[PDB]
């Protein structure tokens, strides 16, 4: 179940190691464009939160 637009949920991800390979390897992904970075260079950086 996903929340409605007007009450969108928010989950905090921290204190973990993130692997974006499984994210970008999902077939029905259609609209995936990134602004500050490039999607192929998300696996070699550390983010604050």
């Amino acid at each position: 179940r996903f929340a409605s637009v007007y009450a969108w949920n928010r989950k905090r991800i921290s204190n973990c190691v993130a692997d974006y390979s499984v994210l970008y390897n999902l077939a029905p992904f259609f609209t995936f464009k990134c602004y500050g970075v490039s999607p192929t260079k998300l696996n070699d950086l550390c983010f604050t939160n």
Binding site: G36, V37, S38, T40, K41, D44, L45
Partner: protein, 49 residues
């Protein structure tokens, strides 16, 4: 270089190289003006002496 793909990163750095390079040409040009003033005062101290 560690956040943008190589096709696009060549646009940002050129906007940074051409600024640092122009900020260094200004320094040289100002020195050429100043060195032509001391040369005008070392040719007056050589006449006073």
């Amino acid at each position: 270089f560690s956040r943008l793909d190589k096709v696009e990163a060549e646009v940002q750095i050129d906007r940074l190289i051409t600024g640092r390079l122009q900020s260094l040409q200004t320094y040289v040009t100002q020195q050429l003006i100043r060195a032509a003033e001391i040369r005008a005062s070392a040719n007056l101290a050589a006449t006073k002496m």
